[PDB]
C-alpha cells in the first residue's frame, strides 16, 4: 500500500477536524460500529451493557474510548506510514488481550462513514480515497505484526 504525499495531506488535513472536536468524533464512530455490527459488543468486557444509541450517547466508557481509539490512530496517521514504532504497540496490546484483525475492517467502514456525515464538503472521493489506503496500510501492517506474535488475529 502506498499513498502519494498529497494523499497523506488530504488525510492530514481531515484529521485536523476530527481533532476539533475528538470526543464527538469518537461517540460517533463507536455508535456507527456497534449499530453497523452489534455482533462486536459482545467481545467487549466493559460496552456490552449499552442496548440502544440513548445508552450508548451517555455511556462515559464509550465516549472516553473513542478518545482513546482516535488519540492513538491519528498519531500513527501523522507518521504518514512510518509508524513501526506506534503500531508494534497498539498490536501486541490488542493480539495478547483477540481482537480479530476483521473488526479493524468493521471500524474503518465506521471512520469513513462519520468523516463524510461530519464533513461532506471537503471530505469528498480523494480524500475518502486517501483515507481509505490509509486505514488499508494500518490494517496490513497490523496484520504483519500479529502474524510475528503468532496470533491468531
Given at each position: 500500500?502506498?499513498?502519494?504525499?498529497?494523499?497523506?495531506?488530504?488525510?492530514?488535513?481531515?484529521?485536523?477536524?476530527?481533532?476539533?472536536?475528538?470526543?464527538?468524533?469518537?461517540?460517533?464512530?463507536?455508535?456507527?460500529?456497534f449499530?453497523?455490527?452489534?455482533?462486536?459488543?459482545?467481545?467487549?468486557?466493559?460496552?456490552?451493557?449499552?442496548?440502544?444509541?440513548?445508552?450508548?450517547?451517555?455511556?462515559?466508557?464509550l465516549?472516553?474510548h473513542?478518545?482513546?481509539?482516535?488519540?492513538?490512530?491519528?498519531?500513527?496517521?501523522?507518521?504518514?506510514?512510518?509508524?513501526?514504532?506506534?503500531?508494534?504497540?497498539?498490536?501486541?496490546?490488542?493480539?495478547?488481550?483477540?481482537?480479530?484483525?476483521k473488526?479493524?475492517?468493521?471500524?474503518?467502514?465506521?471512520?469513513?462513514?462519520?468523516?463524510?456525515?461530519?464533513?461532506?464538503?471537503?471530505?469528498?472521493?480523494?480524500?475518502?480515497?486517501?483515507?481509505?489506503?490509509?486505514?488499508?496500510?494500518?490494517?496490513?501492517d497490523?496484520?504483519?505484526?500479529?502474524?510475528?506474535?503468532?496470533?491468531?488475529?
Amino acid at each position: 500500500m502506498v499513498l502519494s504525499e498529497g494523499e497523506w495531506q488530504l488525510v492530514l488535513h481531515v484529521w485536523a477536524k476530527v481533532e476539533a472536536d475528538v470526543a464527538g468524533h469518537g461517540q460517533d464512530i463507536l455508535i456507527r460500529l456497534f449499530k453497523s455490527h452489534p455482533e462486536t459488543l459482545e467481545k467487549f468486557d466493559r460496552f456490552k451493557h449499552l442496548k440502544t444509541e440513548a445508552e450508548m450517547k451517555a455511556s462515559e466508557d464509550l465516549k472516553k474510548h473513542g478518545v482513546t481509539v482516535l488519540t492513538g490512530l491519528g498519531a500513527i496517521l501523522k507518521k504518514k506510514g512510518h509508524h513501526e514504532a506506534e503500531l508494534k504497540p497498539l498490536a501486541q496490546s490488542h493480539a495478547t488481550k483477540k481482537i480479530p484483525i476483521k473488526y479493524l475492517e468493521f471500524i474503518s467502514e465506521a471512520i469513513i462513514h462519520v468523516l463524510h456525515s461530519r464533513h461532506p464538503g471537503d471530505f469528498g472521493a480523494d480524500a475518502q480515497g486517501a483515507m481509505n489506503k490509509a486505514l488499508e496500510l494500518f490494517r496490513k501492517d497490523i496484520a504483519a505484526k500479529y502474524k510475528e506474535l503468532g496470533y491468531q488475529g
